[PDB]
Amino acid sequence: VPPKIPDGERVDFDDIHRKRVEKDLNELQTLIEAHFENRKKEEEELISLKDRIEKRRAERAEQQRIRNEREKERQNR
Amino acid sequence: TTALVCDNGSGLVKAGFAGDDAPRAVFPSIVGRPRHQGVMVGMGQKDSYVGDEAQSKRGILTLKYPIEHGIITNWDDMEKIWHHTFYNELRVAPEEHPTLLTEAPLNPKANREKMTQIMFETFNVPAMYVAIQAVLSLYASGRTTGIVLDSGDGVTHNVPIYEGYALPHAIMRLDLAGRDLTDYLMKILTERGYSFVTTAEREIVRDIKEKLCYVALDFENEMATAASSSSLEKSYELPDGQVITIGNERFRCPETLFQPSFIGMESAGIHETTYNSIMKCDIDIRKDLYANNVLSGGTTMYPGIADRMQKEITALAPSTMKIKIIAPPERKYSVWIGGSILASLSTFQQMWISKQEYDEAGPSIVHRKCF
Amino acid sequence: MDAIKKKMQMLKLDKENALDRAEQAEADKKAAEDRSKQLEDELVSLQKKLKGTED
Amino acid sequence: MDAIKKKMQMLKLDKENALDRAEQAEADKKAAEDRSKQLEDELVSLQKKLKGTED
Ligand SMILES: Nc1ncnc2c1ncn2[C@@H]1O[C@H](COP(=O)(O)OP(=O)(O)O)[C@@H](O)[C@H]1O
Ligand SMILES: [Mg+2]
């Protein structure tokens, strides 16, 4: 014979609130917080660091030009 | 203690402890032995990579799914998959946790009996229970009525339920699912020049299907539009470059669901087997089933299917009834969420198949009262 | 991105629920008004029958 | 950007439209229901006076 489920009390369709409404606001707020903190940590620091590395690169370029010119001056024979 | 809600599925094994929102570990169910020779010594090369590890070394493996259509065809590989799931993806010994497997409707008995025998002898669980994959998807929606179309990756089945009383004479199980759509897409891609043959490249075609294909609202108009303009051609970059451009293959692959004559299957589409499943029900519960049609399973995630199906059923159904299609955003894990809810219930706590009961009646206990 | 999709989904859930409620209320109005007008017609026929009885 | 604004505004407009339509329908439903109740109450007395007339 097919199984017979013993009779209980309750409930159903009442956990949809407690599993939906929670993340309906908490998840949105938490993801907004994550996006804000990630953008703040990432974008400005990356642009500033790239500018810093660019300045160091320009200084390296000047040093390379000076050394190349002085060596070409001496070695030119 | 807590229960383990495993869900074998066919294509993705989803598991996790009972009482959460999402499965803890989701990974493809493939076991791939290496096929080449291997010359480096001491590299630590194993004999079989299972789960998500074989989706990264798939270049030199021969992946083979252990579950063909719901049924399990290779028991050793399935045992290996279960062992991996328990020990490495969850890291909980099964000696201290009840398990709740899931099984498609109308499956062979021997499959279910072997499943319970394995769970009780090899892994030695305290108690396990097998549940039909559609009732859980109905749990997750928070309903108690409705006809659920659970189009997985192995098999598409359509179980109608009213007021908690399932109708066993109205279950329409059809064996077209995501895998056949992958094969058909791989077969129609050859019309542009792209040939995928290896069992590893089936995964690439699956990714193409997931990311690009969509279900057309009206098939003939889309076929006419894609043949004149070029606003549909979306490109995609293979795992090595050489981008490809998919034209009207986009909506022709998932159209097979509504016209199974494309892959040579005789039966009617998923739009008409639902109506037939409804019409087999009694005359007084057809309105409720019309109003509470539920979608589940992975393959029902195509963009634009919840409108095509509603249009088709509204065409078939009487003009007065209201047709509503419930398509929750968490469709893929709907069965597992329902499984977690069912395992977390207090009323259900005495339905498990306790080990002493199995010792007294053998593996055939599953067909008995403890269903 | 990520949060934007979820916010859109929330805005769509509100859409579906509001639209469904509107349609259901409209059906309720149609049914209730049909009930009222049929009752009024029954009242009219009763008035006419009373008139015949008075004659 | 551009798409987010227009889509969000259109969806909020859809929600508001459905809500106000539902409220109008429910108001008309309540009014029709009360008028129907009045019709019932008057019809009962019409039947009573008809019965006396027939006697
Ligand atoms: N986002 C998606 N879009 C289209 N198809 C998908 C998507 N995700 C998964 N699929 C299809 O669904 C299958 C996974 O289905 P799933 O529900 O995991 O099956 P099972 O019932 O065995 O768990 C995949 O093989 C894939 O073909
Ligand atoms: Mg499934």
Swiss-Prot record, chain A:
<comment type="function">
    <text>Troponin T is the tropomyosin-binding subunit of troponin, the thin filament regulatory complex which confers calcium-sensitivity to striated muscle actomyosin ATPase activity.</text>
</comment>
<feature type="compositionally biased region" description="Basic and acidic residues">
    <location>
        <begin position="38"/>
        <end position="77"/>
    </location>
</feature>
<protein>
    <recommendedName>
        <fullName>Troponin T, cardiac muscle</fullName>
    </recommendedName>
</protein>
<comment type="similarity">
    <text>Belongs to the troponin T family.</text>
</comment>
Curated annotation (Swiss-Prot), chain B:
<dbReference type="GO" id="GO:0031032">
    <property type="term" value="P:actomyosin structure organization"/>
</dbReference>
<keyword id="KW-0963">Cytoplasm</keyword>
<feature type="modified residue" description="Methionine (R)-sulfoxide">
    <location>
        <position position="43"/>
    </location>
</feature>
<dbReference type="GO" id="GO:0033275">
    <property type="term" value="P:actin-myosin filament sliding"/>
</dbReference>
<dbReference type="GO" id="GO:0017022">
    <property type="term" value="F:myosin binding"/>
</dbReference>
<dbReference type="InterPro" id="IPR043129">
    <property type="entry name" value="ATPase_NBD"/>
</dbReference>
<dbReference type="GO" id="GO:0060048">
    <property type="term" value="P:cardiac muscle contraction"/>
</dbReference>
<dbReference type="GO" id="GO:0044297">
    <property type="term" value="C:cell body"/>
</dbReference>
<dbReference type="InterPro" id="IPR004001">
    <property type="entry name" value="Actin_CS"/>
</dbReference>
<dbReference type="InterPro" id="IPR020902">
    <property type="entry name" value="Actin/actin-like_CS"/>
</dbReference>
<keyword id="KW-0206">Cytoskeleton</keyword>
<feature type="modified residue" description="Methionine (R)-sulfoxide">
    <location>
        <position position="40"/>
    </location>
</feature>
<dbReference type="GO" id="GO:0055008">
    <property type="term" value="P:cardiac muscle tissue morphogenesis"/>
</dbReference>
<dbReference type="GO" id="GO:0030027">
    <property type="term" value="C:lamellipodium"/>
</dbReference>
<dbReference type="GO" id="GO:0045471">
    <property type="term" value="P:response to ethanol"/>
</dbReference>
Curated annotation (Swiss-Prot), chains C, D:
<feature type="modified residue" description="Phosphoserine">
    <location>
        <position position="45"/>
    </location>
</feature>
<protein>
    <recommendedName>
        <fullName>Tropomyosin alpha-1 chain</fullName>
    </recommendedName>
</protein>
<feature type="compositionally biased region" description="Basic and acidic residues">
    <location>
        <begin position="12"/>
        <end position="38"/>
    </location>
</feature>
<comment type="similarity">
    <text>Belongs to the tropomyosin family.</text>
</comment>
<feature type="region of interest" description="Disordered">
    <location>
        <begin position="1"/>
        <end position="38"/>
    </location>
</feature>
<feature type="modified residue" description="N-acetylmethionine">
    <location>
        <position position="1"/>
    </location>
</feature>
<comment type="function">
    <text>Binds to actin filaments in muscle and non-muscle cells. Plays a central role, in association with the troponin complex, in the calcium dependent regulation of vertebrate striated muscle contraction. Smooth muscle contraction is regulated by interaction with caldesmon. In non-muscle cells is implicated in stabilizing cytoskeleton actin filaments.</text>
</comment>
<comment type="subunit">
    <text>Homodimer. Heterodimer of an alpha (TPM1, TPM3 or TPM4) and a beta (TPM2) chain. Interacts with HRG (via the HRR domain); the interaction contributes to the antiangiogenic properties of the histidine/proline-rich region (HRR) of HRG. Interacts (via N-terminus) with LMOD2 (via N-terminus) and TMOD1 (via N-terminus).</text>
</comment>
